[PDB]
């Protein structure tokens, strides 16, 4: 049968035009009184999956 | 029959980051330190935690500033 997509991973990344994956940031749910203003402001920006983590979850997102 | 010691903190990578006579950019870190063991010079700024960084592009120069005191400066290349 066909491979199944990791539904948990499909809710946290998107495919760019060049084959990269965009993700969200961590430390953003709660406890904002313990973090600085600059620390919280710069965490609102998105990032891409690192080149080392892609080698481990390539097939997990082969249909996205 | 036990030990009371065994604690320590992670090591910070302090010291110089660029060499004398080397070319750097406007925002290159030059020296990480606790306090002011080396003072800023021409076209150099001191960060919040005493980090020394440049402000223009040029060569680095470690020179002496008074008896038993050192500084770091940056001069544009011509």
């Amino acid at each position: 049968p066909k491979m199944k997509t990791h539904r948990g991973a499909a809710k946290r990344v998107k495919r760019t035009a060049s084959g990269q994956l965009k993700r969200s940031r961590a430390f953003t749910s709660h406890l904002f009184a313990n973090k600085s203003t600059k620390q919280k402001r710069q965490l609102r920006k998105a990032r891409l999956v690192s080149k080392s983590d892609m080698k481990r979850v390539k097939q997990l997102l082969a249909y996205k | 029959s036990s030990t009371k010691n065994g604690r320590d903190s992670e090591s910070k990578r302090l010291g110089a980051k660029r060499a004398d006579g080397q070319f750097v950019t406007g925002g290159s870190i030059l020296y990480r330190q606790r306090g002011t063991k080396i003072y800023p010079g021409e076209n150099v700024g001191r960060g919040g935690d005493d980090t020394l960084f440049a402000k223009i592009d040029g060569v680095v120069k470690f020179e002496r500033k008074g008896r038993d005191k050192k500084q770091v400066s940056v001069y544009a290349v011509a």
Binding site: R12, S24, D53 | -
Partner: protein, 49 residues
């Protein structure tokens, strides 16, 4: 599997939602209209055939 350490997807949070009334269109740039006759009438029924 990471051998016991938390996986990257568990560490990251979810984002966004999906719209049920998503409308998509077939784009046709001004470059693909250089084959028809001068002054001709172009209609979707023709572009699809």
């Amino acid at each position: 599997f990471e051998g016991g350490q938390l996986p990257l997807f568990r560490r990251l949070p979810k984002r966004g939602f999906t719209n049920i009334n998503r409308k998509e269109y077939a784009i046709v740039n001004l470059d693909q209209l250089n084959k028809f006759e001068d002054g001709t009438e172009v209609t979707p029924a023709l572009l699809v055939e």
